[PDB]
Design a protein around this nucleic acid. Structure first.
Lengths: 185, 144, 207
RNA sequence: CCACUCGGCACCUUACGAGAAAUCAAAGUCUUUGGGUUCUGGGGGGAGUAUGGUCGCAAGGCUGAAACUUAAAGGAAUUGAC
RNA sequence: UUGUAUUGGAAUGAGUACAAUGUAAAUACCUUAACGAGGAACAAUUGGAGGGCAAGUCUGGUGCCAGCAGCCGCGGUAAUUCCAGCUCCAAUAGCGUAUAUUAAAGUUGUUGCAGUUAAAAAGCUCGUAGUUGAACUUUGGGCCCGGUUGGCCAACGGGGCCUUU
């Protein structure tokens, strides 16, 4: 038969289910950033767990070990590109100090709110899913898209929507017609 | 010290010693002897199906006081005879003799649960419909 | 206040200004107002209350998240009374903690300097230094004590009947106190021995 | 009789220590975990029962289960009802 | 600038569809003319609310019975645990149950357990296999070359020769 398609799971569940202090801290994040699930938080802490594991391993190697230089620099290069790590903190020991809020800050949903365009994180999410926002030329309709530092200059309304310059939408058009029909008595 | 050999060439005695002592672990011994095939009514499966012979009430253990509702069942694949509990009160009206029922374990890995002496299993489905759906009035049961 | 002990008089007069002097000379502390003025940021947490035959037993931890912690246990006939008196006992027991680095010494200590153990009853608690961003890996009761001390990263292991709550807290409290007992090579240098403040200000302290 | 020394059955004093405690010159030198080596245990019953083997004139000895059943059984030390 | 309730325009795909694209021919995805929200009926579930373990001194019923309950337990009118109604909690296009197995388990222990009184040192001694077994033989001192790193010089590595070799 054809070779197998590979796949993997992308989140992990906390091990104590009803810890009151954890439950409160999670709900504050969901309200601040407009998430719908706890799963959306578990996804980010799962990613950060793998990043720390990799860095923590390399730090046991000798300095000037060729592997530590090659893979260490790649890891840092990659986190700076998305703006999770500040260009001042460009050192492997600062990678261990990252926290969940640093990743949430870079989602398309929150960027579209900091720039204007939207007047709340809840208003922002609806605009993205309804195909009004473009990044460069491409329409993007996924809220969790991570905005690279070069892309921020190019977020704007899509050319094929109202707000962006096209014809009015279906409901606006219906109303104008019915009024004209009554006025065109 | 510590009463076990430490020497660098003593590996044979260490592993032989561990093998002898694992037979005191309760669940280890069950696997290696194959107890679940030779005995116990479900021959190692999680569920089994049977025919209802007769309807019973079981007096609860003291200090509790209740007459709890049970049935005698004969398993189709073995012919072994078993007693099962029927959950959810009035649900006993849904079962009658020569009905066919699906049984599950009562959660305690072969021990009896709570007040009920000697009852290890509970009814899940009767005549192909689930008791939970009947109790909540979501489906109907045909007679036969 | 009107201090009654010799040390209290020097503190109220403003001759002694940091608690590090008191630890350095290993002086006894008898008046809780002394801690209350040298260490104002201290805050308290109540760990347990249970009724006993009726009386109430309360377990209280106090600290500031910057290197000082204390523990106290009191039984009293009223819930508010037990907490009140529990805080007084905890303030008197304050001790310092030594904290350090898991690896290279960039930018302020964040973990313990060495492995340490403590024992009380059957229970034993062991603390191990951890790399940055691990957090405190401990059960909820022990986790709170380590937070108020101001530790950021530490692993723990334990043995014995940990379900007896007060034996567990006492064992952990012993373990963090031992951090200053362990001699390490950067402490090998030789120092002149200071003069005690009770000598220098002897006439301020009397009468 | 006095001083010293090797070996032995005990005693008194001492706790860096150990322990759940009673207590301990080892029951110490163990989360700061490694001097060498032999045997035994893994919740309580069923049960030192059944079955096979082997030793004995016999009484019996040595080796030695499972089905099933149950939420405790057990150690040390405090206070003190009618 | 933040809550609680009378009122107004905007935005959109679920779905349907001319067409083109796709394909061996098709279906579907991606694209698109027309149509397609006001209880937006275009109505989110599955388990719980004594403790372990987030969340009710609420209100009606019932009679140790029907029932609940992994465990401790609740119930004999005065039910924080049964049954129903309100309200609240948790995960959420998913949630619950049974059986096996991994972690928790330093309850199988090489790392790393225990054997006076809690389970456990064999009546005693000899003895084969097995495991284990005291100290000692070229050490030190000179002279060149010498690579790497750090700020000529210092540290760390390395080669050659002499000294009875």
């Amino acid at each position: 038969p054809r070779a197998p398609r590979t796949y993997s799971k992308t989140y992990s569940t906390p091990k104590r289910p009803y810890e009151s202090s954890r439950l409160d801290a999670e709900l504050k994040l969901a309200g601040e950033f407009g998430l719908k699930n706890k799963k959306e938080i578990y996804r980010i802490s799962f990613q950060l767990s793998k990043i720390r594991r990799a860095a923590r391993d390399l730090l046991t190697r000798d300095e000037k070990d060729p592997k530590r230089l090659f893979e260490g620099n790649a890891l840092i290069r990659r986190l700076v590109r998305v703006g999770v790590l500040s260009e001042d903190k460009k050192k492997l020991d600062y990678v261990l100090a990252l926290k969940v809020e640093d990743f949430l800050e870079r989602r398309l949903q929150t960027q579209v709110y900091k720039l204007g365009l939207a007047k709340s994180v809840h208003h922002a999410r609806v605009l993205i899913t309804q195909r009004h926002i473009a990044v460069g030329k491409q329409i993007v309709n996924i809220p969790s898209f991570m905005v690279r530092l070069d892309s921020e200059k190019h977020i704007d309304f899509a050319p094929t929507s109202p707000f962006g310059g096209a014809r009015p939408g279906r409901v606006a058009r219906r109303n104008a017609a019915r009024k004209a029909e009554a006025s065109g008595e | 010290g510590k009463g076990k050999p430490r020497g660098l060439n003593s590996a044979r005695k260490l592993r032989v010693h561990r093998r002898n002592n694992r037979w005191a672990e309760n669940n280890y011994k069950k696997r290696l002897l194959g107890t679940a095939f030779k005995s116990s009514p479900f021959g190692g499966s999680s569920h089994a199906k049977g025919i209802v012979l007769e309807k019973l009430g079981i007096e609860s253990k003291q200090p509790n006081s209740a007459i709890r509702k049970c049935v005698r069942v004969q398993l189709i694949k073995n012919g072994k005879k078993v007693t099962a509990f029927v959950p959810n009160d009035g649900c006993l009206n849904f079962v009658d003799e020569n009905d066919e029922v699906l049984l599950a374990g009562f959660g305690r890995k072969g021990k009896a649960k709570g007040d009920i002496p000697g009852v290890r299993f509970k009814v899940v489905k009767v005549s192909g419909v689930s008791l939970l759906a009947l109790w909540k009035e979501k489906k109907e049961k045909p007679r036969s | 206040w009107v201090p009654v002990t010799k040390l209290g008089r020097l503190v109220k007069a403003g001759k002694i200004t940091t608690i590090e002097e008191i630890f350095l000379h290993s002086l006894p502390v008898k008046e809780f107002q002394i801690i209350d003025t040298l260490l104002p940021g201290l805050q308290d947490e109540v760990m347990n209350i249970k009724p006993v035959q009726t009386r109430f037993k309360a377990v209280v931890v106090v600290g500031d998240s910057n290197g000082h912690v204390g523990l106290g246990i009191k039984t009293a006939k009223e819930v508010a009374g037990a907490i009140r008196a529990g805080i007084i006992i905890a303030k008197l027991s304050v001790i310092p903690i030594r904290r350090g680095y898991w690896g290279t010494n960039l930018g302020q200590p964040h973990s313990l300097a060495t492995k340490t153990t403590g024992k009380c009853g059957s229970v034993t608690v062991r603390l191990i230094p951890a790399p940055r961003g691990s957090g405190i890996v401990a059960s909820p009761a022990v986790k709170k004590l380590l937070q108020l001390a101001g530790v950021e990263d530490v692993y723990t292991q334990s043995n014995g009947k940990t379900r007896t709550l007060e034996n567990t807290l006492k064992a952990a409290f012993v373990a963090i106190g031992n951090t200053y007992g362990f001699l390490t090579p950067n402490l090998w240098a030789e120092q002149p021995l200071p003069v005690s403040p009770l000598d220098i200000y002897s006439d301020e302290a009397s009468a």
